[PDB]
Amino acid sequence: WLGGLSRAAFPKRFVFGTVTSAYQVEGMAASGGRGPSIWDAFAHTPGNVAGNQNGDVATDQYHRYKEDVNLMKSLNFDAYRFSISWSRIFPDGEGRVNQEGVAYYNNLINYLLQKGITPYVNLYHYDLPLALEKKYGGWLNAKMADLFTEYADFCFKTFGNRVKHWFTFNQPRIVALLGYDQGTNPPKRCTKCAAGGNSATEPYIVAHNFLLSHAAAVARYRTKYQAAQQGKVGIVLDFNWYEALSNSTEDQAAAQRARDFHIGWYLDPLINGHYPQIMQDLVKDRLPKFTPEQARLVKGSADYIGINQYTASYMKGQQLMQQTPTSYSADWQVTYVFAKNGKPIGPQANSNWLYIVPWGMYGCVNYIKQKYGNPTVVITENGMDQPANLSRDQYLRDTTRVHFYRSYLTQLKKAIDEGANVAGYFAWSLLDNFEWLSGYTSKFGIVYVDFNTLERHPKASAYWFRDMLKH
Numbered sequence: 001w002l003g004g005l006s007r008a009a010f011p012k013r014f015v016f017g018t019v020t021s022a023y024q025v026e027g028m029a030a031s032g033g034r035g036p037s038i039w040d041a042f043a044h045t046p047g048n049v050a051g052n053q054n055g056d057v058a059t060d061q062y063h064r065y066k067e068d069v070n071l072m073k074s075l076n077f078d079a080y081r082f083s084i085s086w087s088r089i090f091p092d093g094e095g096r097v098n099q100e101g102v103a104y105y106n107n108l109i110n111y112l113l114q115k116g117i118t119p120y121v122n123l124y125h126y127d128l129p130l131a132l133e134k135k136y137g138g139w140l141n142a143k144m145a146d147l148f149t150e151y152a153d154f155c156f157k158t159f160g161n162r163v164k165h166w167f168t169f170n171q172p173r174i175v176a177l178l179g180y181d182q183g184t185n186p187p188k189r190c191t192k193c194a195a196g197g198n199s200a201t202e203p204y205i206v207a208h209n210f211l212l213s214h215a216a217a218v219a220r221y222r223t224k225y226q227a228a229q230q231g232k233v234g235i236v237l238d239f240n241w242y243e244a245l246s247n248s249t250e251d252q253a254a255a256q257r258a259r260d261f262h263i264g265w266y267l268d269p270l271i272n273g274h275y276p277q278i279m280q281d282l283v284k285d286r287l288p289k290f291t292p293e294q295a296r297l298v299k300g301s302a303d304y305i306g307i308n309q310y311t312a313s314y315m316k317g318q319q320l321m322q323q324t325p326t327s328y329s330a331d332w333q334v335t336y337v338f339a340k341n342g343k344p345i346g347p348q349a350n351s352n353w354l355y356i357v358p359w360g361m362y363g364c365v366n367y368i369k370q371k372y373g374n375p376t377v378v379i380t381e382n383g384m385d386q387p388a389n390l391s392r393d394q395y396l397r398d399t400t401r402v403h404f405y406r407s408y409l410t411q412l413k414k415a416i417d418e419g420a421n422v423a424g425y426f427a428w429s430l431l432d433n434f435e436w437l438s439g440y441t442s443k444f445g446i447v448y449v450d451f452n453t454l455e456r457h458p459k460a461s462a463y464w465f466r467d468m469l470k471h
């Protein structure tokens, strides 16, 4: 049932935790003085989210955080990854501070420390203050570095004496892709989109600014707060594994382009101070250039790399063509493939994009180890969802999720046993929550949340964790 897994099976002092994010669990979207984010607007627009749901109440952790902390402690977790709502601190993203908001995260951090749980804090998780979107054009504007840096500065000043583990951003790739390529996330921009946009150029502008913003914030931390606070700052990048369909040159090349356009996009700048060669070759003048000083500032600017790992795909190649630019996605010139040798790569969870493929966990960790000089990596997210409409009892009986973590974790142990620098592992998610476009129709939590009463009940997987992590 534990499949031989336990704390003894991982390096001494390895960190185990669970994850949530502000908008997804806090609730009190329009109270305690909080200002609206782009997701509030988006979520309140009919047709944007399943069943027209939003995060107004969510799991209402804003009121039940202490219950939740007690829960995670009794599950034997060492750490908790959560995010800070920019607009809860700065209703307008700049200027006036919301004291009540500060009070909240103060109370949360203190209670966590009081109960022996280590805070791992994200500064940003999709929730850009609406006011900044309307006034500056959001991440399309280089001015975001200043704005984000001032925001980071206040956090370091205000919680830095107790928070020692920071993350700046969360999956800037999904922002760029879904927000500016496909236009399915706020600000819903893309070539054909009603809000305007350009899927061939904007995705790259956005990513560049994320990187610059990250570097600026880390520069500020390192020059102003690090000495006294002795903290760390990393960044969270999603990485789904890409496997060559066959052993042909063509297919091997494809899988690697996919890797480079997926994770290299951000890792090459962060580790090597430049975008991947292939991207420079293919995207050309649509890819912004880093000035030498910007590159020098970007390179080395992450104390650890958070990887959000979920799934894996087969990749098929093809002769590279000279093409009219249309989209960041089309720039890869690769073909996604379903099965190999007539077998599917793995079964699917509730989410159509989530294929259960344990060995992809190993692919990713190992690849970053081999290709990037083995930097310190943290698995910042890993888990799967159940569908909506099951009975309470069916949720609590998540045998599939139990098998998911046992397998994935076994694969993580294999990569680690082979010398990979993984410092920690975080399960997404602690609670069933607001799953963006899917609203409340997708359940990722190891703890069940009844969205009528908001009661918590731990699932089998919660108990599986409690067993596996006992001291």
Ligand SMILES: OC[C@H]1O[C@@H](O[C@@H]2[C@@H](O)[C@H](O)O[C@H](CO)[C@H]2O)[C@H](O)[C@@H](O)[C@@H]1O
Binding pocket: 021, 170, 171, 174, 238, 239, 240, 308, 309, 310, 353, 381, 428, 435, 436, 444
């Ligand atoms: O999917 C649940 C949580 O996952 C995280 O982003 C996901 C990516 O890791 C994955 O590659 O793609 C899916 C769908 O495109 C993303 O949701 C986020 O950190 C969480 O906010 C999200 O709920």
Ligand SMILES: [Zn+2]
Binding pocket: 060, 063
């Ligand atoms: Zn409440």
